[PDB]
Ligand binder design. Structure first.
Ligand code: BOG
Ligand code: BOG
Ligand code: BOG
Ligand code: BOG
Ligand code: NNR
Ligand code: NNR
Ligand code: NNR
Lengths: 237, 235, 235
């Protein structure tokens, strides 16, 4: 709510290193758009979105507002490019979940060593707990094939794979589990390919968002690292 | 062969991390198959094989069975995709090698930290030796070019280079040298490229084996890391 | 300089790791060359240039002559493959800078822990400063869109960004800032997109320079790390 609050969330408790990379990420994004003012949409979709995931990596709650903008726009822009896997995913799943996420995260916040901001309390699945979730996804793959037969189905397999994985990832994330980042690393190497092949069928893609997914991949390694530090801050000792 | 053994070898002394990844790798391989049951053959070549390399990372000697399955199936699958460089690599090189490797590793297994299972004893090349190993690889390339002049060759360079690099890594790996992992990281980047071209000449590549190799690269870093730990543990 | 001094410069104060990845970076380049004596030009461009950037990484000064050879041959070669953003960047901007650079670094050398070689004294920007430098990059982009407008521009958006970013990185290098390597990590990822599209239009690319930029990416990460050590040694 508070501007004083907004000041904390946005500027509070970044390391130098986190600051450098975020600023450079917005820079490359600014510089790509000061070349292509025409696709202003996808460039907004990157800037809000780079901020979304960098904030998740930090465990900041105000990621969700950014996410809400970002996934919506992206949903449109991924349609205008005939990436149908990404379009139904962002619109139907990510857009409601932004609020759902804000709900359940909101309940589980905490200070962090500078106390200049609030970080979510991160949890760690066990191997057993994990082996279930992996199976869950393979089960619900057959369920994502049954569904979506309706209206026929026009999902190439790979456009398809990146979609199960993305839902499972999103689900661990709202649930505050560190293992989400292992999944995010796979959804990011996959979506980069999606926008890279899209540049051949038909011979086209959008640079702000293909570039966005490269910055996503980097950050998703940061996320895994930082979320580990986070899981310890709230554990056995 | 002991059953109690295969229990240790297969499930013993994994970190939460290694576990969390090796499972997520197999899951993604599975989700891929629940989409295209059509070529299980490749999906199996991927599943057996992720395990191969994940097990070499660990210094686990049972890596060799998984490899034997993996490389043979792989040799076939790359043959159906006109990657004739790779199919001959697996067939003439890797398939006999699982055996030679198993031979030499077995004499140099050690306990490892939890005593829950055993690891190969890793060694480190020196800068001198490594320079020599690398020098060999260029000298040895003119030999791989003279050979294969015979029986003809549309040896595209990319396919060709990765075949030389792969042979040298394999030799170091059987010989239990850490530095294989450096070479592995490069053969993985090269081979990701082979399957990335295979879908322009022409239009069709295998997904499980494209994915397999992305995962191979991830793991080849863990490999490097983990073998440095192995070198410390055993001298 | 002396023959005693050149022994220190080229062989002085390498970690076993840096040494292994260096000799191998050169090995893999040599091999792509034993396959295609066809254009050694790109190969010499690759070899010096790997040496250039590993040398920048180590904070060594004779990176500069290597850079000089590298950026020339390359600037030419990036012309013969019709990559015009890259050719103008290397010739007009880099060849001057190799000189400016040697001038400036020369003032700020220091020894470093083994007392073998001379490392440059690394500094770091603050977040405040970093904010300017990035915002500067944004202004200077529309200002480089003015400049280029005269006599037209066959500048794809991609090529255009990678020239902006590459200059800003090179300004940071000459001024001796650790933060250069974040930029380089982006230009190296961008320049592999460039030589990847160059393959498609028109149906052509050079392996030694596509490899070299993959080896650049690896080394640009090592760069960031070692320059962090390097800032710490010098307050
Ligand atoms: C969208 C806003 C995020 C961009 C990066 C902002 C980084 C602010 O950096 C700030 O610098 C100060 C040190 O001088 C520290 O006290 C703060 O903890 C730190 O957050
Ligand atoms: C081919 C075998 C694939 C499965 C490997 C992951 C299985 C988990 O592995 C095991 O989990 C236990 C958790 O209590 C640990 O105590 C064991 O040391 C560990 O090896
Ligand atoms: C991209 C590949 C990542 C490899 C990083 C693994 C760490 C290997 O680095 C190792 O560090 C040791 C001391 O710590 C040294 O004794 C070894 O010479 C060196 O190879
Ligand atoms: C670019 C010219 C050669 C590449 C670097 C060669 C690496 C040599 O590295 C050297 O190896 C010796 C180990 O015996 C050490 O004594 C030296 O301190 C070390 O710097
Ligand atoms: N790196 C990622 O893909 C990532 C990481 C953390 C959270 N998310 C969420 O997914 C969507 C973007 O892909 C957003 O809704 C994020 O909240 C993505
Ligand atoms: N990551 C790799 O590419 C890798 C790692 C370790 C061993 N290998 C060998 O290649 C075959 C597996 O496909 C086997 O022979 C491995 O010994 C490859
Ligand atoms: N890895 C890089 O991109 C890098 C790092 C440090 C310096 N440089 C300079 O760019 C050119 C190399 O192609 C040379 O001028 C380098 O000095 C590049």
């Amino acid at each position: 709510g508070s501007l004083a609050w907004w000041k904390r969330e946005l500027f509070g408790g970044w390391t130098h290193f986190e600051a450098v990379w975020l600023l450079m990420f917005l820079g490359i994004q600014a510089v790509v758009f000061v070349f292509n003012p025409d696709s202003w949409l996808a460039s907004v979709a990157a800037v809000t979105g780079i901020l979304c995931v960098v904030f998740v990596g930090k465990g900041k709650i105000s990621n969700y507002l950014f996410g809400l903008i970002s996934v919506s726009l992206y949903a449109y822009v991924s349609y205008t490019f005939k990436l149908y896997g990404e379009m139904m995913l962002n619109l139907l799943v990510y857009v409601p979940v932004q609020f759902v996420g804000f709900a359940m995260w909101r309940k589980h916040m905490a200070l962090g060593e500078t106390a200049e901001t609030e970080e979510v309390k991160a949890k760690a699945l066990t191997v057993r707990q994990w082996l279930l979730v992996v199976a869950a996804s393979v089960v619900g793959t057959s369920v994502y094939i049954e569904w979506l037969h309706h209206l026929g189905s026009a999902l190439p397999t790979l456009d398809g794979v990146t979609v199960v994985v993305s839902i499972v990832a999103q689900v661990l994330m709202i649930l505050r589990y560190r293992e989400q980042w292992a999944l995010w690393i796979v959804v990011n190497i996959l979506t980069i390919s999606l926008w890279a092949v899209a540049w051949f069928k038909n011979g086209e893609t959008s640079l702000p968002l293909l570039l966005m997914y490269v910055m996503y991949l980097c950050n998703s390694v940061y996320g895994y690292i930082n979320w580990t530090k986070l899981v310890k801050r709230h554990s056995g000792q």
